[PDB]
Design a protein around this ligand. Structure first.
Ligand SMILES: *SC[C@H](NC(=O)CC[C@H](N)C(=O)O)C(=O)NCC(=O)O
Length: 202
């Protein structure tokens, strides 16, 4: 039984679903695969900022948003919302140490809580070194940024296409593929964990 997670690091609703990914990774016997879809492959300014989701995500999921994000990053004209570098960091963390899910959660915290520029290589290398990957992560990240990332995006978008999935977050359970009702479980990680346990029982 495999849980496929189609995500994008710059998708606010994926951050709202971060507790669901964390809860899923605690279910014994359940395999979890990450699929980055490449949502933004935008400079920060008038167009990118026009946020009203974010406070709604916080109301629904309890996920925190930091002042350095609201009043720092989203106000920084020279920041770029690029989904490719953070996705390559997730790929590299998974390739090096099987820490893809942990790296995605850390990336989202760096962006939404800390207001860091997750599209920049030094920030992603700093996050990898925080997770204890400083030996080899730089080379793995640069390697994953090229043709591995491109192939990963193409694979993810073909999966989205076959499932009729319009966007992120999207969870699909493979036993045969079944897309799950993620909106039902937003803000309910304990319900979500029990649902995945109940699927193993059935
Ligand atoms: S965060 C990027 C967008 N995600 C959603 O709109 C999800 C909606 C919530 N899950 C919900 O309504 O409960 C997105 O993917 N938009 C379409 C796109 O492909 O850009």
């Amino acid at each position: 039984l495999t849980l496929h997670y189609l995500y994008d690091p710059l998708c606010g609703w994926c951050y709202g679903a971060s507790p669901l990914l964390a809860a899923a990774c605690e279910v014994t016997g359940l395999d979890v695969r990450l699929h980055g879809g490449g949502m933004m492959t935008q400079p920060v300014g008038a167009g990118l900022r026009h946020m009203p989701h974010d406070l709604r995500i916080a109301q629904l999921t309890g996920q925190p948003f930091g002042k350095d994000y609201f009043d720092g990053l989203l106000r920084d004209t020279s920041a770029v919302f690029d989904s490719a570098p953070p996705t390559a960091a997730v790929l590299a963390a998974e390739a090096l140490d099987g820490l893809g899910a942990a790296m995605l959660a850390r990336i989202q915290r760096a962006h939404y809580v800390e207001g860091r520029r997750i599209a920049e290589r030094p920030v992603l290398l700093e996050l990898g070194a925080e997770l204890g990957l400083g030996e080899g992560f730089a080379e793995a990240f640069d390697a994953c940024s090229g043709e591995p990332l491109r192939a990963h995006f193409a694979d993810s978008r073909r999966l989205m296409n076959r499932l009729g999935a319009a966007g992120f977050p999207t969870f699909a359970l493979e036993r045969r593929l079944q897309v799950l009702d993620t909106g039902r479980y937003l803000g309910q990680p304990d319900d979500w964990r029990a649902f995945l346990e109940t699927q193993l029982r059935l």
